[PDB]
Amino acid sequence: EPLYENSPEFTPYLETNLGQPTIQSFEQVGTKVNVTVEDERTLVRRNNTFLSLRDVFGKDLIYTLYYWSGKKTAKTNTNEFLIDVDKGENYCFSVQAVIPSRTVNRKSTDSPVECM
Template identity: 50%
Template sequence: MGTLEGDLLRALHSVTHHNFLFFFFVSKGNSELPTAVNITWSSINFKTILQWQPEPTTYVYTVEISGINSNWEKVCIHTKETECDVTDKLEKIKDTYTAHIVPEMLSETEKIFANKVFPMPGINSKHVFMCALAKIGRPGIQTYELTDSKLKVLVEDPLTPYRFPNKSFKSIRDIFKNDLEYTLYYWKDQSTGKKEVTSKSNQFEISVDKGKNYCFYVQATILSRKENRKSQESKVNCTHQRDVLDVPIILTVFPKLCTLKMCPTRQIYKLFIELG
């Protein structure tokens, strides 16, 4: 390397004592900047946002992420924001992760090492177990059908940001497998009496009163969790089956007099009066 970066890297490798002095200086400088506080993780369907305070003025932030089973990585490098989308760094959902929020004053030297990770003492951090953190978003209703005295509902799993090798998105069913359960809440239209039924699959088929309309919604549950067990509720759907009349309507056409297409309404009314 004939560049400034190459010269600096060779110098740091050959002079170990200067190496420690250099990073001690950076650590001391950063420790004098405001420490990030009120650090929070928020995650829905494993799309995870890290937030903190205060807003930077004459400095920037860099976020560092590490799992018990993974190395430190930088994300949102030199940002002036107070939030960072860390989803891509947390795909091993059964791992426990630590985030460092690092305040930094940028110098030319620090810009050169922007992609190197050097965790420093005195920087605020936050730990999280992803499998327990992520809230489950709203499930969808893929299809529903009311026939005779049966209501059939097919639930659509919420998708996560993570992908299979073929680039299709993983659903929460792919993540939680048999730990996922759905509950269907249903009631007669214009009634307050709510019933519920659970299923380990995405399909429901329940017996209902013939000729009545029903409203319903679904909600997912992660059975092994103590917190964040329930998902958001799906939208409420209602069937629109028309009531069947017991007395059939019979229309008799008298070709001699007129047809429905040609008779004015007044003439049809007069016709039925005369025939009656």
């Protein structure tokens, strides 16, 4: 038998890093603003088609929103946020993918920033 070396064990669902998300859009509906996170596709395929991170984690995944004199955070079980905003003010946004149950690598890098 040839010389070889074993790798550490690897459990995808628990260790794979969460990718950088991107804010798909944001609009005002009166005094509130909606922030939509783009579906983050993965390498997992479900019969000719890449599944989104939510398709894979479902409830195991949440998205956090940073908006703004500190910061204001918001969290969602979907890919959308509906926040309260002061009229006449322009806010900026940044989202982060999160899997709360994880102790390490529980969060992805922040998405690019977008402002009204």
